[PDB]
Write a protein that binds this ligand. Structure first.
Ligand SMILES: Nc1ncnc2c1ncn2[C@@H]1O[C@H](CSCC[C@H](N)C(=O)O)[C@@H](O)[C@H]1O
Ligand SMILES: Nc1ncnc2c1ncn2[C@@H]1O[C@H](CSCC[C@H](N)C(=O)O)[C@@H](O)[C@H]1O
Ligand SMILES: COC(=O)/C=C(/C)CC/C=C(/C)CCC=C(C)C
Ligand SMILES: COC(=O)/C=C(\C)CC/C=C(/C)CCC=C(C)C
Lengths: 256, 255
């Protein structure tokens, strides 16, 4: 989505000058590559010629789309769960580990952050972004106790950020990262705005980010009901036919 | 408001051990004293303090506050931080505190410049500020309505400048460093406050409502704000509960 690309670019632009490379032949990893369009931004923006850049994701079709489109001899897309046990091959392998708009998908929060630590090299650093409060969560959440969608949206909480209703998520995450072993930790809760100027660009977003598989017959009907709720919640201005999303993106910069 | 009491206590409890204290005869100031419940918390919490000044723009609030929390050390007066500083308070205060105040203020740059000027040579500041807050959106949904269109004319004077801002922490930080603050730590703190009944949520909206619409209209106004809250999913119609998820920006500076 456009929202995810801007936040990726804005993040890298700011924190790029705070990273240390300190050598030649740098191995890099991105967690939750999806289509690989953001990974391309990370790979491209990074000044160095990385000997190897890996990018993982649990979604099989996404990895295939990515390997088919962005795959090179040094840009390898593999399947992997970051909640699962790491292979010994990757323990302490990566000079930089990246992960944007992914860690809010993940139940086993403590294993993920420990795996990210374990993945990072002795003198390595990590750069992670993830969603806290996001109105889109609330838009779908308002549909989970309705006859129409009650059963499709049963595993809703498995997709909503564990931090969307949390007090001082920055403090909770920072403590988690320090207890994991990271010698340097910096976690910020960044309030963001993203405006949509027509309703179609807002409907395009809701379609892209919908984790549900309601089919084709019901698929259009779901988004319509989400758009109606979005009018009631004032996330889309009915007078102007515009949409406004105000959300928190927690951005993390650690060093082993 | 119970929401402001908690945030104040949580904010002080965390940052108290990070403050630097002078040996004796310290001058302290709290901006936006309001009723003085929070100012009494600030005073009661921190370690024989020589002086405790408080201020406000509301003349009735300071009069209320003086009678109930007035002492020889803790004096209250009227002062607009957006105005020109009285020269007697330049570099006078070793600690300056302001909670749930600086979002009320239009001239954002003079307010912070005045705070810096209020602060002593090696003094520090601890400020809290609202960014995004649903209560802002609740009233904002009544501004184009013909019923309230004239009453909520000056809505934007009371809504936080940072309520729709990208990276308010980066904006506020840059502003504070440019003022001349040597150390600046500004966090955007996501918060949750839960109301278990509609009465206690209704009570907040009444307390925090900045509109003098009068006895025959306030109730009718609150009712209409409560209905918008149902539509915006801030109150759960089923449980008869309410949920506020908002951003409090907390600021720790050294001059
Ligand atoms: N446990 C897990 N391990 C790895 N990837 C996961 C995961 N859980 C979810 N993901 C993937 O993480 C992705 C989040 S979407 C974010 C895409 C891209 N990284 C960006 O920055 O925009 C999805 O593809 C999802 O399938
Ligand atoms: N320009 C200004 N200068 C000083 N105080 C102001 C002001 N504009 C508004 N205020 C005051 O700021 C207060 C904000 S509400 C009170 C906040 C309280 N400290 C708490 O802990 O919640 C109100 O009493 C209001 O009268
Ligand atoms: C400074 O304290 C606050 O902002 C606290 C709350 C929750 C609301 C009361 C104050 C303001 C600035 C706005 C009140 C209502 C509006 C609709 C703007
Ligand atoms: C993968 O798309 C995103 O990162 C989506 C964004 C920007 C916000 C919502 C995130 C996702 C994917 C969850 C979808 C919606 C829910 C109701 C949980």
């Amino acid at each position: 989505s456009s929202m995810q690309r801007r936040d990726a670019l804005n993040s890298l632009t700011e924190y790029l000058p705070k990273f240390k490379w300190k050598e030649s032949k740098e191995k890099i990893l991105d967690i939750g590559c999806a289509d690989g369009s953001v990974t391309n931004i990370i790979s491209s923006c990074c000044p160095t010629d990385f000997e190897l850049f890996e990018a993982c994701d649990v979604n099989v079709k996404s990895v295939k789309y990515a390997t088919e489109h962005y795959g090179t001899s040094k840009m390898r897309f593999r399947v992997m769960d970051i909640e699962s046990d790491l292979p010994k091959e990757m323990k302490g392998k990566f000079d930089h580990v990246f992960s944007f708009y992914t860690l809010h998908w993940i139940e086993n929060q403590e294993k993920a952050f420990q795996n990210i630590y374990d993945l990072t090299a002795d003198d390595g650093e990590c750069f992670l972004t993830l969603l806290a409060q996001m109105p889109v969560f609330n838009l779908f959440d308002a549909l989970k106790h309705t006859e129409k969608w009650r059963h499709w949206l049963r595993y809703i909480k498995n997709f909503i950020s564990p931090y969307y209703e949390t007090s001082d998520p920055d403090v909770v995450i920072e403590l988690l990262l320090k207890r994991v072993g990271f010698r340097y930790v910096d976690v910020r809760c960044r309030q963001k705005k993203f405006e949509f100027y027509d309703l179609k660009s807002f409907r395009n977003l809701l379609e892209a980010v919908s984790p549900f598989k309601v089919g084709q017959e019901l698929q259009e009907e779901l988004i319509d009901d989400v758009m109606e709720v979005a009018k009631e919640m004032r996330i889309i201005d009915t007078q102007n036919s515009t949409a406004k999303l105000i959300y928190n993106l927690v951005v993390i910069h650690c060093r082993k």
